[PDB]
Amino acid sequence: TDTQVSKDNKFDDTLNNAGANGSLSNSKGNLGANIAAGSGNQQDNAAAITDIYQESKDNKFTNTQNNALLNNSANNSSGNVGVNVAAGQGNQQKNNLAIVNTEQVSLDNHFLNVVNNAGLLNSANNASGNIGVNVAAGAGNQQSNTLTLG
Amino acid sequence: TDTQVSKDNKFDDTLNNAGANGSLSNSKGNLGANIAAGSGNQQDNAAAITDIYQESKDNKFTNTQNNALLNNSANNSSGNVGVNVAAGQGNQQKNNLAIVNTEQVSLDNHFLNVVNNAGLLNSANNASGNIGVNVAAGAGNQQSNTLTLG
Amino acid sequence: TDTQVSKDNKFDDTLNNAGANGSLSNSKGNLGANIAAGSGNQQDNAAAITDIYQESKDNKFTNTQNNALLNNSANNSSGNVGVNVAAGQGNQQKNNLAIVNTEQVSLDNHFLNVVNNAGLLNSANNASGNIGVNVAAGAGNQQSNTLTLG
């Protein structure tokens, strides 16, 4: 049982770059990657072979260039792959994988506004099995993946 | 069982770019991608081989150029492919895949208004099996996909 | 039972570089790495073969270039791999591994603003089993991983 909670938080604004170059190219079984470039993002990965939460209560976001990017990656993979990219302030990410519950809530928040760039370059090229990709560029996006075999 | 909920949220406005270049070109089994460029979008993917929710309660959207795009992608795929693109503020996305329930609700909201650009460049070129694409550019669009084999 | 807590803390601002060159290339069983470059980050690893907390109460962050990077690493691994990279001020990291609970909370905080660079160069190349990667560049990101076999 995992939990990730964020109560009140005052963000006031700046360069934010997050990326993955040629990497995770090959895989077997499960694989999960989450990339974000922001202020209060949340990331979580759960995988297994053979009950989680993510809360984001009141936060004051006030304001900058945000670059969340993913270059060559996850090209030739077998099994499960989950990729989530977001360039915002309060995004939430999650990946659930299995071989042979979930909840993501965002309560009251104050987003006020700045350039946000998401991205997915040459990637996910030859995926056998399962694969899920979520890309967003905003303020309060939410992403989740769920894959299984057997 | 997955869940994605967004209670009250005050969005006040800005550049938002989200895209996927030549990627996901080949696939086997299942594949799902969701791209959005906005404020409070929600993304979820569920796939398997061999009960989900998405709520969006009251949110105050007040206001910027939004660019949600997908260049070359998902060209030669075998099995299931689900792509959802939206350039708005409170869109919701979902992909359900299987080999061998669902609900998406949007309660009260306050959308007030700005350029929104969706897009689907050369993609989905040669898909064998199943494929579904949903493109929208707005404020509160909702997208969902459901594919299966066997 | 582990615990990592941070009460009030006044951070006022500077070069911060943290990286891992060609390393952790091979592995067996479990492996977990966390890299951060900031002010009040928290790191924790828990692995086993055959009840943890992480609190971050009020902290005043006021302000510098932050470089959190990971070059070649985690290439050919068997079993479980968990990598978390963050370039911020109050990020939190955790890795849970097993063969054959969790909570991460961030209470009130004061983030005020500067360049933040995350990164993942050629890595995770050929991972058999489980692997999870979380990359962020911000102020209050939170990362967690959970993998198991058997």
Author numbering:
A (entry chain B), B (entry chain C), C (entry chain A): 45 to 57, 60 to 96, 110 to 122, 125 to 161, 173 to 185, 198 to 234
Can you quote the paper on this entry?
An essential structural component of bacterial biofilms is functional amyloid (FuA), which also has great potential as an engineerable nano‐biomaterial. The two most well studied examples are the curli system in Escherichia coli and the fap system in Pseudomonas, in which the major aggregating protein is CsgA and FapC, respectively. A fully experimentally based 3.2 Å resolution cryo‐electron microscopy density map of the FuA protein FapC from Pseudomonas sp. Each FapC monomer consists of three imperfect repeats (IRs), with each repeat forming one cross‐β layer.
We reprocessed the data using a 14.4 Å (3 × 4.8 Å) helical rise and −6° twist, corresponding to a monomer with 3 layers of cross‐β structure. When we performed 3D helical reconstruction, we obtained density maps at 3.2 Å which show great overall similarity between the three layers but with differences in details. A model of this FapC fibril was constructed by fitting the density map of three layers with the AF3 model which contains three IRs of FapC residues 45–96, 110–161, and 173–234, while loop linkers and other flexible region of the protein cannot be modeled due to poor electron density. Residues 45–96, 110–161, and 173–234 comprise the FapC fibril core of layers 1–3, respectively, excluding disordered residues 58–59 of IR1, 123–124 of IR2, and 186–197 of IR3 which form part of the core but do not show sufficiently high electron density to be mapped on the structure. The Greek key‐shaped cross‐β structure is composed of five short β‐strands, each layer spiraling around the helical axis. In addition to the many hydrophobic interaction in the core, the FapC fibril structure is stabilized by an extensive network of hydrogen bonds.
